Enzyme design. Structure first.
Site: not given
Ligand SMILES: O=C(N[C@H](Cc1nc2ccc(F)cc2[nH]1)C(=O)O)c1ccc2ccccc2c1
Length: 113
Positions: A9, A63, A81, A104, A107
């Protein structure tokens, strides 16, 4: 439907995002409108072939998955989410979503597996 999908993403946060900071910017200052403008600009460049999805995600995604060229790895339902989950499971492998809204930010998703 598989048990899990693997997606990449590109997230564009805005000043009203749940966590309005990222690895690339101490404070997210852009408006929701500007974030959607950026997302639509990326879609158009990916569709024309001017930009590569994973290359754009690696340097412009808000992200932390940007370090993995946008890869989130595999996830089942009930993890991400809900609007992100629904968009992800509705894609075929190799398909990219249009804009997807979560708490967040905004995307673009690419289903890889
Ligand atoms: O929450 C993360 N980063 C959040 C942003 C974010 N990424 C998303 C992906 C899907 C979603 F539904 C909402 C999101 N908000 C961050 O860096 O603030 C996040 C989540 C899962 C991950 C898996 C692999 C590598 C990095 C990741 C970061």
């Amino acid at each position: 439907e598989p048990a899990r999908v693997r997606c990449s993403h590109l997230l564009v946060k805005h000043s009203q995002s749940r966590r309005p900071s990222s690895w690339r910017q101490e404070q997210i200052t852009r408006t929701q409108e500007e974030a959607l403008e950026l997302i639509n600009g990326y879609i158009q460049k990916i569709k024309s072939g001017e930009e590569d999805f994973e290359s754009l995600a690696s340097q412009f995604s808000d992200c932390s998955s940007a370090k993995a060229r946008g890869d989130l790895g595999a996830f089942s339902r009930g993890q991400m989410q809900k609007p992100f989950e629904d968009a992800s499971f509705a894609l075929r492998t190799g398909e990219m979503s249009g804009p997807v809204f979560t708490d967040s930010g905004i995307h673009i998703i690419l289903r890889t597996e």
